[PDB]
Amino acid sequence: VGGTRSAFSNIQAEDYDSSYGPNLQIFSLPGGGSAIGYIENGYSTTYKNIDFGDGATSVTARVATQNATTIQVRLGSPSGTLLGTIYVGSTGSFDTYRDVSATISNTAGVKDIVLVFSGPVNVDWFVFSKS
Numbered sequence: 001v002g003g004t005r006s007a008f009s010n011i012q013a014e015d016y017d018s019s020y021g022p023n024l025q026i027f028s029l030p031g032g033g034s035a036i037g038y039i040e041n042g043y044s045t046t047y048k049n050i051d052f053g054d055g056a057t058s059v060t061a062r063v064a065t066q067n068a069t070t071i072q073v074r075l076g077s078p079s080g081t082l083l084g085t086i087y088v089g090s091t092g093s094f095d096t097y098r099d100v101s102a103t104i105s106n107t108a109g110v111k112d113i114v115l116v117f118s119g120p121v122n123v124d125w126f127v128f129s130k131s
């Protein structure tokens, strides 16, 4: 139990190890599971010890928002190397979740991953893959 999490299976956004976000909340979704939300510019969540194996070059996140925003994917810390940026257009509602993807620089081994938020968005989960 609680072995190293794979980059290639969904990582629940509420399963962060550390964060910056005084108003950030975890809440239940109608369809099952939970999301993070009540996010503001400059908030972040950190996911320790994610096993990328011998590499991933894409990320997909299941997200909801009413206004275009971005989610930076960074290595180690909120000011660490920028791996890529997910562009999150409106999903019409904070309750309507859709999958959005972005390229990242090749990331391998066991790494700490940080999501850095530029504005309001709700996140259910995210996952990596080889493009």
Ligand SMILES: OC[C@H]1O[C@@H](O[C@@H]2[C@@H](O)[C@H](O)O[C@H](CO)[C@H]2O)[C@H](O)[C@@H](O)[C@@H]1O
Residues within 6 Å of the ligand: 002, 014, 015, 016, 017, 018, 026
């Ligand atoms: O799976 C990652 C780790 O998650 C830890 O739980 C986090 C808490 O430490 C923190 O206080 O809150 C967040 C949000 O609820 C939790 O995800 C576990 O305690 C670890 O055992 C686990 O490795």
Ligand SMILES: OC[C@H]1O[C@@H](O[C@@H]2[C@@H](O)[C@H](O)O[C@H](CO)[C@H]2O)[C@H](O)[C@@H](O)[C@@H]1O
Residues within 6 Å of the ligand: 036, 037, 038, 039, 094, 095, 120, 121, 122
């Ligand atoms: O209504 C639930 C959602 O509320 C969102 O916050 C909104 C802010 O983004 C906006 O600036 O103000 C309105 C008015 O209160 C807020 O609803 C949260 O960001 C979402 O996480 C939440 O799902």
Ligand SMILES: [Ca+2]
Residues within 6 Å of the ligand: 012, 013, 014, 033, 034, 035, 123, 124, 125
């Ligand atoms: Ca979730």
